[PDB]
Design a protein around this ligand. Structure first.
Ligand SMILES: CCCCCCCCOCCOCCOCCOCCO
Ligand SMILES: CCCCCCCCOCCOCCOCCOCCO
Ligand SMILES: [Ca+2]
Ligand SMILES: [Ca+2]
Ligand SMILES: [Ca+2]
Length: 435
């Protein structure tokens, strides 16, 4: 046992091919009503990760890097596509002008263990109980910072986990260099993000989680979750209630750095149910997000790509369904084809219906607007089950998204809503072990 004995060297080959076409309702467009190219690219990633063992069972090191390789990109494809690297190397230099290949050092961390306590420092991903999170493409984003936590297992009485994380820079996986954190104006600095959270597992399928976070001088962020599982008619019903909240520290609602008025939140209820080869999902969300921004963010810095935060609800139906006032219901099914002697293969689909979405409360926007949006998707996926390629994911995802207004994308006070789309994503994720 130790630094070398327990070392691993692993990697990944990743392939992404996407066609996303979006209806253009920009008033002066020559292609008004047409589904023009929004994304059209073919891109690979390659990753390699060294993870040491623990010298003296207390000290180790992880180093990971990845490259992006561009096979094809239409001149009309938008930027950044989040699989290649943005042509701009840091968060706040983003101008949406290009994508490129490159290489990024995405993990470079000292790791520590001392009794029940653990820590990681350097270029790290959040790994404990806080509400800080990386963005995920094929690879995760990278914080410059440190996290420490502990776990106390009380056996029958349950297990407690908690951790604290602090960071002063970040890069999304589409940026090669870390940037600092700033307010909405992309100028006023935010000297750190930090977060504290906890989890208690009662060992009877009840799990409680909670976390608090701050962007220095700017945003307070909240998370709570209760999860439970029990049988309904002989089959497991999994349930969760989730609360996500945020407030800024700029009360003046017309200040350009004010993003929320009072407390903003996203609340969710989820149910999952398995019957034979079918896995069913029924989920719903509701949002309050008064203020200039007009939608809820799980991340504590508002600028695109600038950080991320924990959000357990993911419907893969293109829209975030997170506008001020918006309510949304999701229904989905996946069918395991093992009984057709296609083990590892699954197919499914899903549907979202959302309504009551309101714009930003900034008075320059028409406050009478109420927006509905809906979507459906289809899924086909295979996980290879034997051979050197065991664990490889091959997946095709297809979405039709419908914005039930004529508002041009990102317009009308709906700064996070875009127009109708057809989206086709094909991906291969092939992990491999060197030692
Ligand atoms: C920075 C230290 C790299 C050491 C690599 C040695 C790998 C030996 O591992 C053998 C299998 O376990
Ligand atoms: C310590 C973990 C607690 C997780 C359970 C959710 C409690 C979060 O409360 C936030 C405020 O919620 C507003 C009230 O909404 C109705 C409550 O929904 C069901 C609560 O289980
Ligand atoms: Ca380019
Ligand atoms: Ca405010
Ligand atoms: Ca429409």
């Amino acid at each position: 046992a130790g630094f070398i004995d327990d070392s691993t060297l692993t990697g990944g080959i990743y392939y992404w091919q996407r066609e996303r076409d979006r209806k253009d309702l920009n008033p002066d467009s020559k292609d008004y009503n047409q589904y023009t190219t929004n994304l059209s690219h073919s891109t690979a990633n390659l990753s390699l990760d060294f993870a040491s063992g623990y010298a003296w069972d207390m000290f180790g090191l992880d180093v990971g890097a990845f490259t992006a390789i561009e096979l094809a990109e239409s001149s009309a494809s938008g930027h950044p596509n989040e699989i290649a690297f943005s042509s701009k190397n840091r968060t706040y230099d983003e101008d949406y002008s290009g994508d490129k290949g490159g290489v990024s050092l995405y993990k470079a961390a000292a790791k520590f263990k001392y009794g029940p306590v653990w820590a990681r420092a350097g270029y790290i991903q959040p790994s404990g109980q806080t509400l800080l999170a990386p963005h995920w493409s094929f690879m995760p984003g990278t914080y410059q910072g440190a996290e420490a936590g502990a776990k106390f297992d009380y056996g029958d009485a349950g297990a407690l986990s908690f951790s604290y994380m602090w960071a002063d820079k970040y890069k999304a996986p589409w940026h090669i260099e870390v940037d600092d954190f700033r307010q909405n104006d992309k100028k006023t600095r935010v000297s750190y993000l930090h977060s504290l959270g906890a989890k208690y597992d009662f060992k009877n399928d009840l799990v409680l989680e909670a976390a608090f976070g701050q962007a220095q001088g700017y945003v307070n962020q909240y998370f709570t979750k209760a999860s439970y599982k029990f049988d309904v008619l002989g089959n497991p019903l999994t349930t969760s209630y989730q609360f996500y909240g945020a407030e800024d520290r700029i009360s003046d609602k017309n200040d350009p750095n004010s993003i929320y008025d009072g407390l903003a939140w996203l609340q969710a209820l989820t149910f999952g149910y398995t019957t034979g080869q079918f896995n069913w999902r029924l989920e719903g969300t509701m949002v309050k997000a008064e203020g200039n921004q007009g939608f809820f963010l799980q991340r504590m810095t508002p600028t695109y790509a600038s950080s991320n935060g924990r959000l357990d609800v993911w419907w893969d139906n293109r829209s975030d369904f997170n506008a001020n006032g918006e309510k949304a219901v999701y229904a989905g099914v996946m069918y395991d084809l093992s009984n057709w002697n296609l083990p590892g293969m699954a197919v499914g689909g899903s549907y979202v219906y959302a309504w009551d979405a309101k714009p930003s409360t900034n008075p320059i926007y028409d406050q009478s607007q109420r927006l509905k949006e809906s979507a459906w998707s289809l899924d086909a996926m295979y996980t290879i089950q034997e051979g050197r390629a065991k664990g490889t994911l091959i997946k095709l995802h297809y979405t039709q998204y419908d914005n039930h207004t004529n508002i041009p994308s990102w317009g009308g006070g709906y700064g996070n809503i875009f127009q109708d789309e057809k989206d086709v994503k094909f991906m291969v994720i092939a992990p491999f072990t060197i030692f």
